[PDB]
Symmetry: C2
Subunit: 104 residues, 2 copies
């Protein structure tokens, strides 16, 4: 039923120590934050990263640490929800599939 590509490739500095959270009652995730730099002539982007994957999440919990440089691949998910039911807002996260640990 025909295929697509959604893949973001990031390489940056992790900005917070990972957080363990729980999506719905039973979907564990560790979430952290990563900064990218727009090096332009003549300015930081902060990405929110979610690792839902059953082994890759435990590993990025003990090994991701603020100031670590990391290369990472995944999917964009815009995470749209209604706020206090009213305004439709979006909470976009990069859902990581691959984290190659650079320091250490």
């Amino acid at each position: 039923l025909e295929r697509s590509l959604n893949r973001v490739h990031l390489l940056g500095r992790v900005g917070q120590d990972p957080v363990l959270r729980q999506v719905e009652g039973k979907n564990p995730v560790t979430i952290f934050s990563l900064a990218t730099n727009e090096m332009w002539r003549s300015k930081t982007t902060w990405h929110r990263i979610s690792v839902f994957r059953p082994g890759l999440r435990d590993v990025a919990y003990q090994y991701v640490k603020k100031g670590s440089r990391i290369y990472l691949e995944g999917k964009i998910d815009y995470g749209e929800y209604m706020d206090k039911n009213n305004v439709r807002r979006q909470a976009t996260t990069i859902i990581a599939d691959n984290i190659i640990f650079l320091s250490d």
Copy 2:
């Protein structure tokens, strides 16, 4: 500073005709959406993600504008850019766009 990456590779079908945006008295933007299908086994659960594609680059803005249509299959590469506006209190939101710098038309 030291090199960072922010690249998005996307391939899919355009969801609407492009829209040029010169509202203010600024820099014009071609805007369209792109659908991407995520379908996963373990089971087969289908999911579609709609992405807001912006192209500012002088030239590719124009090509994107006359040539992409609703229906076109397309490959592009960009950067994720969040909305980043401090909406109320300072209680901000976003309105994230992929800003395209390369569009390959699959025909």
